[model samples]
Target chain A: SGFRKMAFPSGKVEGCMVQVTCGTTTLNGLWLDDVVYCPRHVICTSEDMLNPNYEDLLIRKSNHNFLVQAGNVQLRVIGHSMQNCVLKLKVDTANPKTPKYKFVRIQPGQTFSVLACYNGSPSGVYQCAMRHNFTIKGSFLNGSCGSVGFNIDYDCVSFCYMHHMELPTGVHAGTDLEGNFYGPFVDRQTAQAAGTDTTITVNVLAWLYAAVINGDRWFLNRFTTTLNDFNLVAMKYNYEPLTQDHVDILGPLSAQTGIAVLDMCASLKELLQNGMNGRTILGSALLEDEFTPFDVVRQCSGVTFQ
Target chain B: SGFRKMAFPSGKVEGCMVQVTCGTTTLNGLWLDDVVYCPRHVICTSEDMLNPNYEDLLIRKSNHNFLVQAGNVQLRVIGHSMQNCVLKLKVDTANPKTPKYKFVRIQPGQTFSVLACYNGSPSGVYQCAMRHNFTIKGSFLNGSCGSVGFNIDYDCVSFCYMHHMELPTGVHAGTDLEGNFYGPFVDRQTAQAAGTDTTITVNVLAWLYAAVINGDRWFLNRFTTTLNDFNLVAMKYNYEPLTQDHVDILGPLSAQTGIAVLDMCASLKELLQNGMNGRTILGSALLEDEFTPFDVVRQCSGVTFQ
Candidate 1:
């Protein structure tokens, strides 16, 4: 048989649903093909076949509280300053279908506040989206603004503010069990509360304690809410020393589960210990023949040998 | 802890199985801890400590036969010279409570005739060894004497020669099935026998017809042996359209059984397909994706998918 070459045909670009009049316009087309048209320019190319630009639809404004997630959460618009501004918060969870989520109004110097809660589900694929609105010259340039989406799992819980610049800068959101650092807030008081301590580990307990001690009520509430979502099955089945059935179930789930808290703790401990000794922990002669301490603990805990 | 300089002890030489000889050796009061000497250097270090001379202990030789248990069947031995060599064959059956094995000695410059009969266990591990002795010039002298040992395996129906040399140089024993070359033969006769088509792929009637037409005694012998092996199984089975259990038993064995003929054929097929347009066969690609190809075949064979 003779050889054959294959090529896929290109598709057309879609128009923007939320187009600003005075400012630039960004068009996020269909999931397959989308394009963006800025002021006096059409930025469309074959390279846009995958990731399209949708950044030109909004302009800078003051005290503009965009109702991002209209029915979900309401974000408080605090600052109208051209450079530095802060957004306040008001969460009302009385409605189940439309629970109070968070939103943001993007501008040069506006501040926005948002809260999120995590329920202990099996480590798997998850997506989170925060809605926002756009304004131009103190007027509503676009009534229907879009949201920012993030893919997160237990292993990759940390989402830095630097990742998205359309929103005001704030502390990063991370799944740090210990409240030492790298979490939604500095301590437990500022974290959300939703679950009991028995469902969460001491590391999470530390996070909550840190939030509370640091007077971070926002974080404390979120952490509590996340804890509340932890079902008995999740709490009992998540750790080591699994039963026979647990072994069978978790054996297949190993590929799906995210990084564990013990792994982080061990890494942090080794880093600190080696840093104090002025030697690299990985290639050190002292630890050359020694099995990793984390693996030792895992074995001792009767985790799956596989 | 106080600041301290780390220093290691000096390296010391040790010996084992002492048999010292000297002229007028003085037995002075020279007390030493853990000291011994042997005619040959065979030092014993700490139980867990690696000896500094570990690398020196490793020796490399060329043209050794390998009894591989992967893929098709094959046999191999190295050449001592360009001419044919005389070789003897014997096998160990009963357990001797020690390293009991039959020795096959081959002389240089003689054709080694192989009279092999497939009359062993259906499928299992078997050990075989080939030995050859020759003389060479010694350093500081013209005369030299030493023995070189070549250990090999004949597992299932395949055989592989063990090579100690870094590169191919000497005459080695090997087999060829279909078109795959498996060795550097000690003699041409052995290589010719291996190159013959011993495949039992055709039906008995067709095989007999071919044998009558071409005087193929090798094919006849192979077909008879395969029929005998097939009859040995308690339940009758068809190999043409193999059953699930049949495939399960044969697939791994064909890939890993140390059988010469089977291994050579499988290896030859793989090599041929890989060399064709530098592309692998579709079957191999499917196998590489997942071990679930059996299910697809079973479904196509009119079996219930579930």
Candidate 2:
């Protein structure tokens, strides 16, 4: 039913209304919008309290927990109302602490925080609003047919709105929607346990990929000394120089200029060791290039914004 | 005299012309511009002939060395020219190898390559076009007062047009043009020997400074374990938490959050060891955010362009 007073309902409540009657037949109810509302409030209350009247519902309690909506949950404090049917709630005045940033890269068999936004071009920029932690397990691999293929496991949050949706995790060397490349995925539980965000991780990985495409050989070869050593080994056996498309296979290889190549490969090892997790927001200017904060509730449900 | 044929010119030559006699002073002379031109040609010839005519001047010997302009020295291969004075040199066909990039920092007592471009804001972008290596010496120090002062030794290239010119090397704690913080500087002999450019070094330091101003604690602390350790020490002694102006003073100090601070100081040690030098150009796109390359020849002499 669209309107009810909650007798023993459970599971996940979404898109429903609750009635608060002042008298017997004047059907004045609180109109609730469409959302998955988790009223942990129900489990805590004691006594028969099956159908409370409007007075009990509207009474001011120090710890009154009200379920307004799912997307943006808020606490309500009813104010003075001349008319019995109308009620008012206090506006929220608290601001969240500044956000954080983390930059890292994942390897073929590593579990990492799920990304909310990403871009392929070197100059491209993307940003996200993170309210909860998410995870997706995946692998980076040398493709079967000499191309780069990054795969992720099946996950609703990412799979539904990913730019290249075809490259789901666990699919071995699957082609992307553009019929070009292949791509992991992890879970909400593991991410929640880590207690970190994925803002900088997204930027870091994108920059790494862009650096590879841009061919920043010096940066590619530094810190990760083994990258050049691997290229040297490949050259001993007459392997071809690595290109952006061929990065997955290089593992350790060289460019056409006879110089050993590393680029993105070097970041793989560092990212694995350091573990990318947002610590604190660097700055608002640092995030100016980022798109608006990502809303999981809206985005996962196919909601579009102007 | 406005022009003269080369006899026994020595030292640094600047702003003059060399005349070439044809037969009976037909007066076919190459007009030189205002620049410091160095001709090592006269010392090689053994004959008593000091002045050469246009015939000898326009010889097409395979190894014929011509004295061209200073700013853009060129090896000329004159094509068939019926007119005596009109010398047509072949257009340069061979392209130089792609440039390199290096990101590094220098300590108070350390020597490093000179920088050509930089920005103070995290969002600010500056770039330089490097040809020859340059060097200067300087230090990053705690200011006499509570300010950040980065000083550089006197040098023509940087001192001529540095954004923060007052922060020259050897100064204890000088203020900038904006009456803000203080600043270091390094040399060409040591730089040429190191065989590198300062492209990424300028960028890395600028980014570090910007990160500090933006207050990204996680990024400021992650790599440099010692930064927090220092902050902890400062707390033990009841020292105030560090700020952007107090960065130079933060050899090791804490932030108001009780977490230790690091930021710019961490980069100092890393830069001292790795060295700041250009290894290779990442890409033209990577250079897009960078302002047009820094031109030493023109900027040093106060030349302005639209």
Candidate 3:
């Protein structure tokens, strides 16, 4: 989580998020590709994640936080700025660079938008870095970035396609995606929590059911819940222990769907080492988005890029 | 429609119905095939017709009249008879001729069921006949077997998957399938009723939407209704005059769906007619259940062989 050193988001930082803002306004985004991500909304984007369009203007979890596409998209900086500095849009996409960026100098009253073009893996986000008088600072959308760094992930529209299937170790599921973050469930707080990490490896069923069946405000809530759920988890394939909170989450799910859930804590035949999607928090906490955004989520050791 | 002088129900007959008296009672006959027809239920094993088992069975057309599985399904005849006659069962599947049948002679007061097995192209209804002293007499389930034939179709578990696609002429769809019956708009009546031409050629979005949203008994009704609709129509390469009946149906559909029907329809003009799985149901009729089961539905002059 050392920013003074590494350029990419790395180290023990698992559930880190970074804020990307222009002045006081946080960027609103969506996606475009062969797969339609809502004609006007990301909530109605996929048949898999049936969530409503986003409503929250601050939560980094909403897909609206990053509208990325193949062509050029104009990000209008509504008001005039107070300083004369270069607006650097740093990104980590399609395996670009550690902190690869695009820059445009701005004046005190210039109401202009930044244009950043990227290619490759279609990974990472754009963390706004304002360079003035030889000094650079990152924008934190929600708040604290810790040593982990801030991130405003307006992902690039690329050709990367991960299936609606399980994730093995090393594969980075995706940033700002609508499902489980595919990674390694290397460890679990309680060994038994890791037992049978295979089944819950992937699930868009509930998301789809929620958005499609309801098709309204309810989708918004579900989108927020699942987005947060996806990003905040470690996404480990190494099979980690299931947190009691997650276990509770699993309990009521069976009533809602035909998808098979884990058998209640029985057949204690020695505990395995993982939980749903095989992620482990080491029994960690997510106090209302405990993990903030990251400047550039560079894939290194822990996660693999799809 | 002449059978009084014939040994069995045959000769220029139209709708023929024969009484399959089970000794003192009559047996309601249907179809038997590789798709396995239960003399009782469609859900004799799967999820469409019944509970874990098929018991209090009353309703017909539920693919139950004959749940004939692997070995023999003894259809018990509960009564006594005077003549020592043997009961015979004849059917037409992929082939109209060829000695393909099995039977057991049942006597009065013997309390025995008929044992009949016939295979090949899993199509056709069972034509029952009574054999007394080497003479055959047609046994229609309802009544007389001349000009008036009785039928209880134990349809195969083939869910017509007629896709949201189009069709052309002379392209046979298939036997038991899950899509498109591109029969030509050849001439709804003269295009050839093809007699018991059992095939539907169109459907409505309302039925689809209802069944999907509900997925219960309501779906069952909608499913059956749309299924029948898709089978009994003509799919012509040349657009046929919009019949008042069809236009009226479309009217209500537009009022309900809100989308422009013909606008959507005409924009869809000049479309090369095709259907689900890219399969075209060439102009033809699925007489009674001519094609049988399995479903690669290869097209020929005016038919498809699965």
Candidate 4:
């Protein structure tokens, strides 16, 4: 109606769009510092309106609008003493024409929370203020400008709970004792079996036997598995390699029976030492009984006793 | 026959002192990092011996002959981790053929003493050596050494016993009540009055009151006397001193006698704010009463109230 259209058999019409000319809006203390803006009606183009791109906008010389959305925020109190102060929040709508919002009445060693709901419609500014009532006696303010938004459902956010788990068993074992002696012993055995050398095996066997009988379990555990496991592993590798069928047959049994056998061997060794009464062993049936299984006699036959 | 004669004839011929060359001595596990000399032995010198200077020639250097006097030598272990070691003593006998010796063991966490009888004629150097029996498998010779002259009597040496001492009490007060307030209170005036400051007076008053009313006799006695003494000195100089006595005068009292005063000012403040409903000040009082006088205030005030 304002600009009437005149049309004829062969005529053209020209028109233009009108600028809305929205008013200006300002925000202060959104962060540790203050901020302001213009074009209240124009939507805020920047994602972080409270903390906007002032540096970029100044360079471009372009006008933009900001919309602040309500979101959850966190406040953390630090240090041993400040753990008791109370935080306070206040919103002032007294000046409806130019309403000013604020937080107040905060107390020491306390914390407070407030809801922010502005969605770029009813263009206005919102302020956040904090005050402590007990010891600290000052008010701090932060602000954001945009349309106020409302929520139908309000629920409190939850924090994740964490718990520490402890180990089931208290004891742990050390490294392999048998391996230390077995490596040297096996090398010497190979040489001697082929008529090369015998002294190495004899010397290694003495140390190995001493360690098995006298070495502290705690110390041994620090280096390898328990003595039982060491014995089982030694037997399996030095005695016989398993085939597929043997593995199927003995694997389960070894898991169950190996412990018992190793335990018996340890007990037998203890009993033999107790019977000897600190005497040096030369040759006897008792020695034969012990020597036959471990091949110590055959290994030691050619070696000299110190 | 003496080769040397006395240099100073009439200065002060205290006595003929035996100058025995000192050797290394060890104490605890640590070797005395410095040299320790024994007391001088003053006696008549033989005319046949070479006395270069009677002052200098306290004892004969050659023809080693020294008298032995009965004496006791006392030593105490100092420094950390020094327990459980042997102390070896070496006395200088001018004749290397026979070395004077004594052995002492330093028990762990304990001081030890030994008695020695020395001949008046001193001929050899006396030194001490400490050996670590704990590391006997390694080098025992790696111990520490300290040496002193053998002529001195070691029996009279007194040692200080090591005992655990109490920690110094710390009082922190600051303007921010809910902030990091160390000492006694939240402000300068309170702290000063409690011997801290004004702002801290309430907390200090509470602590002192708790100590007194709860039968913390030791703390009450010490605090009352110290605070009273401080106020008396302060008043004599016309200074308005903020002390416990001042708090006692200005704060709440249970009776008019000035003998049974208890500051309930903080309780009253809390009650006004309806903050005292579920709290147990009396229970805390009972706990404070049960605590030993030395630890009463520390135990009571250690907690932070929310």
Candidate 5:
């Protein structure tokens, strides 16, 4: 559960064709420095590589540049430089739903960086965001660290505002839309005060559909690779991982029924290109209170996806 | 919403309080910094206080201790240091669910230090850790901030393992414990690979709880302070955040109960002494297999709750 780094020397790493799996959906990779090379790539981290969410977590040219669906959970202190920082904490064990535990020292950045290795459990939810100390040019005596502080002892800590995301069955397949930061139309204050998440659900297939229909090859590669990563899906060697080459070689298919896969490939490519704009939630940012796209969709031909 | 800072001259920040209520339980003083000097103390921070998560953020004793909470949605980058970081994004405008925006650079550190600031909508969850960069040592370039090493990028890149944290019900409210570095029993590759959590959720509450129960008083002050910073909770003037004074007035409660609280306090001191031993997960070093105390509890009286 600590930090792990993968320095892909050739600017790429390939999977050994091994099968693996884990407990959840695998949308491997979140951008970071190491991944700049693979803008649409998901790099390797310690925790991910060690346990194996699925099968392969490497980004390779042969994998179709697949950038699958998403996400990790960690404490991040963002600022140029925070001084005298000590993070105190209370962790939970699955033993009790309420959770209980204590922490001593460890913390993060505002300044440069400070990474503390936190302990975790595969069971329950624990609470963190405690006893953090730092300074933005202040004048207070510093306390010690651990359930303590140093630098200029400011009064206050932090609370993690986490909400469960249940992708609903609606929003249809091929329905891939960007969620607003901290959530759709949410305010930092609102979430903090509410202490809960605004409910939102989506049909998981929508994302898959969108990727394929739009010929978003990159997104497609990501999906399959991510599934393979968690062993959720498997791509048989030489026989599978349907690629553009396959279409070129085998023809997409017969439209109205012709010899083999008639001119389907060309038409499919053309059709897919036309929808490249993608579908998205309309006015999602402003609907702060709550509304539904289902209503708007009924009047539209789903032509708004991009 | 962005980072807010508070400056406290005294160990306290006073708010003209008149019984304030939210949705459920009325646990006042959940917001202020500890006026071990006052007991019912709330600290200060910018919007945390300026606007108030509920109350204020705080930094105390003149300029030293300031703490405040937030209620904003923003992007956070975590890893080692990200160089010349330019974070670009389209901030939410209460408009589009599918956003249209761009430009930026930002980022991190470790025990090494990195920093990044991101714009976010107060509503839904968004993307972070998309871009980052770095510099390594040792010819091939070392990405060493505090831990592991691999990969071969000579410059910088970042990776975010921030997954959605599910705050499920049932761990029990009084259930506080410490999750080890990825968790007491988690592995580096586990959550990373599993696409699941390294599985350790805990909070720092257990620490403060023990401090109060053991009559440590010292840790108690620290606990109250952090609470004040992030607006998760607030404190009242005369009302209270059970402090050392309350312990003095309340006698901590009965001979069996009160006397028990005392002797228990003393014994906790004793028991606690014999075991700073804090039974952490075993062999977690090798695989870092994340686990939870779900099995550990129910085995005992389950009464050790604070």
Candidate 6:
């Protein structure tokens, strides 16, 4: 619907946890601010505290930085904030024929910010929590907010590598690579089902890049889709379905396995390192991260994914 | 592509004509600013000086005001300002099968204002010249400005009777009725034609209401279209095709001739007079003007239009 803001209650607050999970992929991090301090240690919990109206409930800790596999629907998040503890998540309700992976990342230095407009005039800007590399998979739909437009902007590399996303009107949410601001992409059936003057359909894809230096981990994601269903083109690099055989060769720890995917990630990472660059199209700004070695093993060992 | 600002060339007293014509619908009025003076004498001209790169060429004057009869394309205008003397016009190039009528009105007190954004961050707000019943027929496309989003707001009755318009991406323009803010409507073929990532098309319609009291005219337009082509619905109260028989019965001076059209205008005008009403869907807010007597003739005489 519109932008929502939340923060921890006042008084002596020990640190809290923030977790967003879509399918098996969960983003875990610590909540800082309000004079609450947590040491430099990784602490992930295991509790279902993502109820939109939950009180004080602790969630999971950092197991393995999760990745969105195929067939995931709604996204869920639980964190510390006054009155409400769960973040209303946006996700595509429709299931895709082919297994595709998409992600939105929120991290320190780089954050996800959205500007909500009432009747086209901006109300205000709302941003997600910092501290963690908050990431999500699949797509999203605007809930409770009803039919409205959103100017979704996020910094994968803070002002350096940024994206200006145009979401679809009426109940749908997602971004496009063309950087064309206005309306998110939707499908014909979905659009029609949403009612007349409800939605527009388009192709969807998400981009992610991260790296670890001196034991510190850093990662970001770029979400993109088509203008509508009319010109739906396949995105450049996506997670090809992995079979049991391929999983065994690449090691179950390897979330992705393909040379082309690594190549795209390599170029994207290089773009980030270059620092100052103007708005570039999605896929065009490709790069890699600390996990490329795992995917390299799959590619070199002839491990084909489903 | 973005908002533009224009003002009188400064100094040298007197007054200037502001004319915008799309096909035959010419909106004429005098420019009042910078301590210029002109009495209550209506002076309409016949000049063709709407070049985007003109240096001051006086254009047309009010000739029974004017109406955009069906088959017109490419709206044009000529006015006074510093660098450019012409206001860039936006209109639909795609010729329609039905003789559908659409219009956009800009008048005094209730002026047209636009908000432009750079990388999703708003740059500034730009408004059109106040002092005239500025109107245009059919749809518009965002030219020269290239592909960018715009937040277009205008007060048909100043803060009271207003509309929030959402336009399409790429080089396209127009507004919608549902009051949904986001990308505009575009047909599937048109979207495809505009390139894989160019535009989105949907049904288009325009709303207009005007009247004269004490020899002073006041009019405004509400442009509405579908989200995209998916849910194209027919709009209420449009200029129906007028046949020779209807024209003869309604008098040649009659710009629109239909009981339904006048009925719609009647309710719209009433909505305006009532003032202080929240946002209502397009046709729902209808009222009439001083010229409804002419259309009554065509309806009573059973003069069927095309």
Scanning candidate 5 chain B in windows of ten residues, the lowest lDDT window is B170-179
**First chain of candidate 6, TM-score:** 0.17
User: What is the descending TM-score order?
Assistant: 2, 6, 3, 5, 1, 4
- The local lDDT score (0 to 100) that residue A16 gets in candidate 2 is 19
List DockQ for all candidates.
0.01, 0.02, 0.01, 0.00, 0.01, 0.01
**Candidate 4 positional error at B267, Å:** 48
In terms of lDDT, the best-performing candidate is 2
lDDT of 1 by residue, B37-129 (tens): 011111112331232232332122122321211012222322211101111111121112112122333222111111110111010011112
Global CA lDDT of candidate 5, please?
Answer: 0.17
Per-candidate iRMSD: 33.5, 32.6, 37.1, 53.0, 23.8, 27.4
Q: Assess candidate 4 and give its TM-score to the true structure.
A: 0.13
Model 3: per-residue Cα lDDT over B71-134, one tens digit each: 1333322221111111123322321211222322321111111111112011111122211111
Model 3 chain B worst lDDT window (10 residues): B1-10
The better candidate by TM-score, 1 or 5, is 5
**TM-score on 0 to 1 scale for chain A of candidate 3:** 0.19
Residue A188's lDDT within candidate 3 is 15
Q: Cα deviation in Å at residue A233, candidate 5?
A: 60
Stretches of model 3 off by over 4 angstroms after superposition: A1-306, B1-73, B76-236, B270-306
- Candidate 5 vs 6: which has more DockQ: 5
Candidate 5 or 2, higher TM-score: 2
Model 2 CA deviation exceeding 4 Å by range: A1-209, A212-306, B1-244, B247-306
What is candidate 1's CA lDDT for residue B216?
A: 24
Per-residue lDDT of candidate 1, residues A4-78 (tens digit): 000000000011111212122231111111211111111222343234332321123333322212112332333
The docking quality of candidate 3, as DockQ, is 0.01
